Amino acid sequence: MWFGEFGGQYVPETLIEPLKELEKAYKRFKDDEEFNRQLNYYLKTWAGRPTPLYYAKRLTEKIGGAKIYLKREDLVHGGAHKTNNAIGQALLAKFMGKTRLIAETGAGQHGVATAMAGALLGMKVDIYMGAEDVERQKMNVFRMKLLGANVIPVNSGSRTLKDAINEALRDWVATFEYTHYLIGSVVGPHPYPTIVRDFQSVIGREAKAQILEAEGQLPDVIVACVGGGSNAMGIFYPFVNDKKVKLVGVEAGGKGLESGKHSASLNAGQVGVFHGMLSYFLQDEEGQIKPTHSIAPGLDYPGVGPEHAYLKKIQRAEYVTVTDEEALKAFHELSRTEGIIPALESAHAVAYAMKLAKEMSRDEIIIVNLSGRGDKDLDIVLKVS
Amino acid sequence: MWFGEFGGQYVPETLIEPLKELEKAYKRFKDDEEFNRQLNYYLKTWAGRPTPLYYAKRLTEKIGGAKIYLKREDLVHGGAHKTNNAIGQALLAKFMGKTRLIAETGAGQHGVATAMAGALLGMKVDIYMGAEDVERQKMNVFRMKLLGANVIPVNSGSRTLKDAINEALRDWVATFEYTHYLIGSVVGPHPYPTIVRDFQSVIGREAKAQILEAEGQLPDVIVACVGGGSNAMGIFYPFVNDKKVKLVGVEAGGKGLESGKHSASLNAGQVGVFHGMLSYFLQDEEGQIKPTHSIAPGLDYPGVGPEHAYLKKIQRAEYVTVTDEEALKAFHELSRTEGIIPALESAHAVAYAMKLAKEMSRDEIIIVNLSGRGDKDLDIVLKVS
Amino acid sequence: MFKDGSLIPYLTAGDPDKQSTLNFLLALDEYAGAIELGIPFSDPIADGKTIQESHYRALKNGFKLREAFWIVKEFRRHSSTPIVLMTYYNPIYRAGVRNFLAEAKASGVDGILVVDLPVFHAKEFTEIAREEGIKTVFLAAPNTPDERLKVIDDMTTGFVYLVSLYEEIPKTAYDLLRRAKRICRNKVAVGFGVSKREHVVSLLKEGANGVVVGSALVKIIGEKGREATEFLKKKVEELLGI
Amino acid sequence: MFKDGSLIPYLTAGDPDKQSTLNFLLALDEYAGAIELGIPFSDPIADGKTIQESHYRALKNGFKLREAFWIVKEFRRHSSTPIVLMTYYNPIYRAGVRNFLAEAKASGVDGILVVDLPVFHAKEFTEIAREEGIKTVFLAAPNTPDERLKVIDDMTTGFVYLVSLYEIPKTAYDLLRRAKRICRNKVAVGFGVSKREHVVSLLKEGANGVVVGSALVKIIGEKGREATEFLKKKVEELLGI
């Protein structure tokens, strides 16, 4: 449950038994011949794995520096890496004998993923969402109802994500005998940070095979965006022992670090305990969660996974920021140059990769983790542009 | 040129020289080692090829009949089979030494497909669009622009698709020395109908290999939707010499054939000569093109490919219709049941497949060509629901 | 099939209605050595913007195929000026090739140009046209090679119709004419298309047997409609130098 | 750490302001055997809707940690009723465990419950608590097995605080039954009491104290600065007077 000093299981006694059941269930089914056979069947047959590793020939020539490969997670079913974890946990829940999935969502991206996975394996899906978020995400809400899920608007307090979390946890505490709670990222109490990483590790395994196939050697740098950490850990983890490979997590710089409107939890946060984990969080003088901002909705989260805090600590991974403006240029630049419309979360990774590539030799190799497609971001990008 | 009595090259003398240079160039590069090596490189790394063959285990068991596999073209880059042809013709244009692509569109899906492939291969891209269609398809116009193409609105005449075709063809006659005209379906004058099929035959070649791998045998039936013919012909062609396999084209029944608000060209249209091809067209008493309708934008086309007309005559393929209500019922059904939100075009093929499964035993097999994802169709489906 | 140095008005049939077209034909007859009459069509691929509009004006006004033949039958009561029928292949295909050309001949039509029927697809059409006493008309563009132009000429029994690709007569259009006069045995008419007196005199001087006038005339029919007659005559008078 | 048969009011500090919380405590002190005082937190993942709202209210009006201690210190000028501080771990973690507990003791805090600090992560907390003169409160739920409930009891030096998963649930009386059977420590119940029937019934089944939170904070939520008299009427109802 620890990653160095970070991680843990800082929850009340009401949530201990459901987590201890999940620890046990993961332990037996994690390396089970039949569990992994089913997981790999669904990932291949339903999700479309493996995803290709694409050489951005035009983009690298433009920059004039290092080679830039995109790990095309935009091409998985749903349009983001989140499907990998959605299936993984939903299948684990079915192997536990659960008949129902619950989760909570802000932007709706995790709600859609959870609903899709529940639809596949034939499970009841109740998704808690803040009443503010339901009006904001008209189209994501509808998308969940198409997939057989039903959204529960929570009308108390802030009417934000945080209020939906509380409703989801109160619901799990009472229904855990037949219900599994699905966490979207490498965050929260143990065993969720390890479970989610393990279900995203496919990205890095595939990418390592693919880069050895294309280059005959490991890459010099790997760049990936970091909100909670999910996609970044998926691609990072298999390269952690490869001393050559530089790991660069890219957080939301927002309107700039001087402005204070961002979600760079690793760059500008303090270590604290929220959401059941000791990790980095963005907090005020009094040690309360601050409001965060990012143009990319998936990066708008004040916390960060405890494993990233650990990598930061021991200096295995380097963590950086990219502004709304910079990510937006990358969004446009990749669409023009490679004919790929990246998700605004991924555009952060692409944006930094492009800066880094200019300063590197033409024989060096960068793998950018293109965490999703940006069809969902067209309403946002149209209004701003 | 011909498929039985259908097809041809019925265009004015102005368009003969451009078409003959395209004939010669296709005959040159079609079986070329380097053209095909590059084509499969882009299909693999960029497009995400191959796509998986999904077994709809819950949809088959709910129906309680024949097995129902789905060819997952929804997973290709761009969310639709169209990308296959778009890359093929764009690459062909590049090998011909052309710097520019032109096309026209109504719904916008083809205009996006062309804009994507052009951006990939460094081609300049001008799309012609009817100014009414520009007003409807705000988001596809924006998508094209993001992808680097400039959308040229034509304000002459009706301001609809056929006015854009005229403007596009006039431009080609002038600029064909450095410009390729990119037809989006198995339609129009030779060589486009054979060319588009060939670039979509990949779908059938994969499906064949994949169903043998899964079941140890060829399918009993193959079901696919038919607007112009592109996707259906792509999955059909490699099974044309297999006498076992039945081929079924699903046209747009719309609001019903008795109501006259359909786009089923084969089932209730007469043979004629428009757009440079002898084929089935929806015409009035005077032999002029009647207005067409379907809820799925991609099926709303009065013509159909000449090769489908040929397969209809020789009875190598059955052809049927499905109503807007039934496609909507299938759109919702496949979403709830399998976690896959199909395109409204594909939902026609699914809707018929669901019927045909009831009249076949549990050991018999159906392959439905799931031509695209329905993220594009959510506004349309939200309004009617 | 027409007097050298002739002006050839092109009108679209049933634009705005069958009677109004006949009125224009009767008004323009004394200025013309021959006449082209277009048959409306939903999807005209070849034609430019001005003609394209007139196809839609005619079909929005409820044009029937029979009414094209009615104009020529009615026009033949007053005149023996050559009529060329300009159409797409669908109406011919639909009715039957012998049936269309016999009914056209019977109406009093001398020539026919099938716009979207290429030279290689016209073997059976030119064979039946001779049999039915209709003279064939085939068009050529600037991008038409010398090889194909000979074939176009070989199959033409009326006149070869030269056209430019899209102000002024383009340099490329005069190159097509000069080549055609070297190569073709048939008479040559040119739709380049014309708007001023300098253009007509120049084209005849460089060997054009006929100068066709479409867009200048149908643009007036677009503006004026039923009331176009007098403005058409004034325009033709300008082009003839009267 | 309180007289048997007692009623224990739970209030969130700084809801709606610090002066109001002190007024409420002073007005309720004659009715109470002990008091729980909640420390506002941005993301309180345990608490039910009515308490959750009070955290939102108190922080919206600019509550600060030093104001909780001020309330306990100014309350101690009049009363020596046991105070139990109810907080999440992050205030303790960021200040330093000893620094927090020392400052809590100086105000006159008698006990402390760290809501989101499990038993297996509290080996150090209980140790320093004892050294700084502060008693520990740990909570048990109905799903808590008999193995942990003993370990919970062993680490508690004040009282075990029983809560429910959700008139009063059957599953909640089973927890209380088991607790009195297993625990050497005293037991306070926080099962969501709203009426007199419940206070009497829970004292009858052996609860040493009955905590009253939601019923009082609902009133503070409705009335604000003017809650004092409505709180008294509610506490009088629950005491049956």
Who contacts A123 (Cβ-Cβ below 8 Å, separation ≥6)? Answer: A90, A93, A94, A98, A99, A100, A101
d(CA B251, CA D179): 70
d(CA C68, CA C70): 5
CA-nearest residue to B156 within chain C is C49
A184 contacts A113 by C-beta, under 8 angstroms: yes
A334 contacts A350 by C-beta, under 8 angstroms: yes
A93 contacts A102 by C-beta, under 8 angstroms: no
Whether C144 and B275 lie within 8 Å, measured CB to CB = no
Is A64 found in the same domain as A21? no
Interface residues from chain A to B (CB-CB < 8 Å): 44-46, 48, 51-55, 58, 72, 74-77, 79, 115-120, 122, 139, 142-143, 146-148, 332, 335-341, 375, 378, 381-382
Which DSSP state fits A244? T
d(CA B312, CA B314): 6
d(CA A88, CA A39): 7
Which DSSP state fits A290? P
Whether A12 and D49 lie within 8 Å, measured CB to CB = no
Residues of A in contact with D88 (CB under 8 A): 273
Q: Strand, helix or coil at A214?
A: helix
Q: Where are the domains of chain D?
A: 1-241
Q: In A, residues 287-316, which contact D (CB 8 Å cutoff)?
A: 287-289
The verdict on whether D36 is a catalytic residue reads yes
Write the CA distances from A97 to A25, A38, A43, A180, B339, integer angstroms. Answer: 10, 15, 21, 10, 20
Tell the burial category of D165 from Cβ atoms under 10 Å away from its Cβ (0-12, 13-18, 19+): middle
Distance of CA B91 to the CA centre of its chain: 19
Write the CA distances from A87 to A97, A142, A145, A223, B73, integer angstroms. Answer: 15, 21, 18, 25, 20
Task: Give partners of A (≥3 CB pairs < 8 A).
Answer: B, D
Place of tokens 């431009």: B171
What is the helix (H) or strand (E) element at residue C66, kind and residue range? helix C66-76
Residue closest to D108 by CA, chosen among D144, D87, D129, D81: D81
Beta strands in D115-173 (DSSP E): 135-140, 159-163
Whether A338 and B120 lie within 8 Å, measured CB to CB = yes
Strand-pairing partners, residue D36, are D10, D84
Write the CA distances from A190 to A93, A356, B5, D233, integer angstroms. Answer: 16, 35, 70, 45
Is A344 found in the same domain as A241? yes
Q: Does C145 touch chain B (CB under 8 A)?
A: yes
Q: Does C148 touch chain B (CB under 8 A)?
A: yes
Whether A339 and B119 lie within 8 Å, measured CB to CB = yes
Is B105 found in the same domain as B43? yes
Cβ–Cβ pairs < 8 A, chains A and D: 95
Q: Strand, helix or coil at C161?
A: strand
Resolution (angstroms) stands at 2.8
Is B337 found in the same domain as B247? yes
Is B97 found in the same domain as B16? yes
d(CA A373, CA B248): 33
Backbone angles phi, psi at B163, to 5 degrees: -75, -35
Query: Which one of B143, B333, B336, B379 makes the best mutation probe of the A interface by having the most chain A beta carbons within 10 Å?
Result: B336
Backbone angles phi, psi at D148, to 5 degrees: -75, -35
| Structure token pair of residue C141 | 């563009």
Place of tokens 């008493």: B285
C12 contacts C218 by C-beta, under 8 angstroms: yes
Place of tokens 């199959």: C155
Is B101 found in the same domain as B76? no
Q: Domain ends where: A168, A200, A232?
A: A200
d(CA A70, CA A371): 9
d(CA A235, CA A349): 13
Interface residues from chain B to A (CB-CB < 8 Å): 44-46, 48, 51-55, 58, 72, 74-75, 77, 79, 115-120, 122, 139, 142-143, 146-148, 332, 335-341, 375, 378, 381-382
Whether D52 and A166 lie within 8 Å, measured CB to CB = yes
Catalytic residue, candidates B185, B230, B294, B371:
B371
| Structure token pair of residue B82 | 């169209």
Q: Strand, helix or coil at D161?
A: strand
Of C46, C65, C94, the CB nearest to B12: C46
Who contacts A312 (Cβ-Cβ below 8 Å, separation ≥6)? Answer: A266, A280, A319
Q: Domain ends where: A200, A216, A236?
A: A200
Which DSSP state fits A339? S
d(CA D117, CA A276): 9
Whether A157 and D143 lie within 8 Å, measured CB to CB = no
**What is the Rg, in whole angstroms, of the alpha carbon atoms belonging to chain D?**
17
What sign has the CA pseudo-torsion C100, C106, C109, C111?
A: positive
Letter string b/e over residues A269-306, b meaning 16 or more CB atoms within 10 A of that residue's CB: bebbbbbbbbbbbbbeeebbbbebbbbbbbbbbbbbbb
Residue closest to A114 by CA, chosen among A130, A127, A128: A127
Backbone angles phi, psi at C168, to 5 degrees: 180, 155
d(CA A116, CA A77): 9
Who contacts A269 (Cβ-Cβ below 8 Å, separation ≥6)? Answer: A280, A281, A282, A283, A302, A304
Whether A147 and B79 lie within 8 Å, measured CB to CB = no
Tell the burial category of A132 from Cβ atoms under 10 Å away from its Cβ (0-12, 13-18, 19+): middle
Whether D163 and A162 lie within 8 Å, measured CB to CB = no
Whether B16 and C148 lie within 8 Å, measured CB to CB = yes
Which DSSP state fits C50? H
CATH of the domain at B181: 3.40.50.1100
d(CA A330, CA A354): 8
Q: Which CATH superfamily is domain C1-242 in?
A: Aldolase class I (3.20.20.70)
Residue closest to B194 by CA, chosen among B47, B3, B10: B3
Q: Strand, helix or coil at C188?
A: strand
HSE at residue C171, side-chain half, CA atoms within 13 A, is 0
d(CA B197, CA C183): 40
C134 contacts C111 by C-beta, under 8 angstroms: yes
Of A55, A142, A341, the CB nearest to B45: A55
The answer to whether B and D touch (≥3 CB pairs < 8 Å) is no
d(CA B292, CA B254): 9
Backbone angles phi, psi at B134, to 5 degrees: -60, -45
Q: Strand, helix or coil at C152?
A: helix
Strand-pairing partners, residue B372, are B80
Of D49, D121, D163, the CB nearest to A10: D121
Is A315 found in the same domain as A249? yes
Nearest CA of chain A to the CA of B332: how many Å? 6
Q: Does B276 touch chain C (CB under 8 A)?
A: yes
d(CA C18, CA C33): 22
| Structure token pair of residue D28 | 């309720």
A328 contacts A347 by C-beta, under 8 angstroms: yes
Q: Strand B100-105 vs strand B179-181: parallel, antiparallel, or unpaired?
A: parallel
Experimental method of this PDB entry: X-ray
Is B191 found in the same domain as B265? no
Residue closest to D137 by CA, chosen among D68, D213, D86: D86
Please tell me the total number of residues recorded for chain D in this structure: 241
D201 contacts D168 by C-beta, under 8 angstroms: yes
Residues of A in contact with B79 (CB under 8 A): 375
| DSSP secondary structure of C76-100 | HTT----EEEEE-HHHHHHH-HHHH
| Structure token pair of residue B59 | 């949809």
Is B279 found in the same domain as B233? yes
Q: Is D66 left (phi over 0), alpha (psi -120 to 50) or beta?
A: alpha
Residues of B in contact with C45 (CB under 8 A): 11-12, 15, 165-166, 169, 275-276
Whether D48 and A13 lie within 8 Å, measured CB to CB = no
Q: How many domains does chain A have?
A: 2
CA-nearest residue to A340 within chain B is B116
Q: How many CB atoms lie within 10 A of CB C208?
A: 24
Is A104 found in the same domain as A7? yes
Cβ–Cβ pairs < 8 A, chains B and C: 97
Residue closest to B12 by CA, chosen among C63, A51, C142: C142
Is B100 found in the same domain as B156? yes
Residue closest to B200 by CA, chosen among B71, B341, B70, B81: B81
What is the amino acid identity at position A164? Answer: A
Residues of A in contact with D53 (CB under 8 A): 156-157
Q: Strand, helix or coil at C133?
A: coil
Give the CATH architecture of domain D1-241. Answer: Alpha-Beta Barrel (3.20)
Q: Strand C135-140 vs strand C159-163: parallel, antiparallel, or unpaired?
A: parallel
What is the helix (H) or strand (E) element at residue C197, kind and residue range? helix C197-205
Residue closest to C84 by CA, chosen among C123, C139, C23: C139
Q: Domain ends where: B157, B174, B200?
A: B200
Of A55, A72, A117, the CB nearest to B339: A117
What is the helix (H) or strand (E) element at residue C22, kind and residue range? helix C18-28
Write the CA distances from A327 to A101, A176, A330, A381, A383, integer angstroms. Answer: 34, 40, 5, 11, 15
Q: In A, residues 152-171, which contact D (CB 8 Å cutoff)?
A: 156-158, 162-163, 165-166, 169-170
Is B112 found in the same domain as B72? no
**HEC states along chain B?**
CEECCEECCCCCHHHHHHHHHHHHHHHHHCCCHHHHHHHHHHHHHCCCCCCCEEECHHHHHHHCCCEEEEEEHHHCCCCECHHHHHHHHHHHHHHCCCCEEEEEECCCHHHHHHHHHHHHCCCEEEEEEEHHHHHHCHHHHHHHHHCCCEEEEECCCCCCHHHHHHHHHHHHHHHCCCEEECCCCCCCCCCHHHHHHHHHHHHHHHHHHHHHHHHCCCCCEEEEECCCCHHHHHHHHHHCCCCCCEEEEEEEEECCCCCCCCCCHHHHCEEEEECCEEEEECECCCCCECCCCCCCHHHCCCCCCHHHHHHHHCCCCEEEEEEHHHHHHHHHHHHHHHCCCECHHHHHHHHHHHHHHHCCCCCCEEEEEECEECCCCHHHHHHHC
Whether D141 and A13 lie within 8 Å, measured CB to CB = yes
Of A17, A166, A273, the CB nearest to D89: A273
Quote the domain boundaries for residue A371: 48-81+201-385
What is the amino acid identity at position A281? Answer: F
Which DSSP state fits D163? E
Whether B45 and A53 lie within 8 Å, measured CB to CB = yes
d(CA A250, CA C1): 79
Q: Does B278 touch chain C (CB under 8 A)?
A: yes
Q: How many CB atoms lie within 10 A of CB A32?
A: 12
Strand-pairing partners, residue A55, are A69
The verdict on whether D47 is a catalytic residue reads yes
Residues of C in contact with B273 (CB under 8 A): 88-90, 93, 116
Place of tokens 């060209």: B265
Backbone angles phi, psi at B316, to 5 degrees: -85, -20
CA-nearest residue to A15 within chain D is D46
Write the CA distances from B123 to B145, B150, B171, integer angstroms. Answer: 14, 12, 16
C113 contacts C138 by C-beta, under 8 angstroms: yes
Residue closest to A222 by CA, chosen among A196, A240, A195: A240
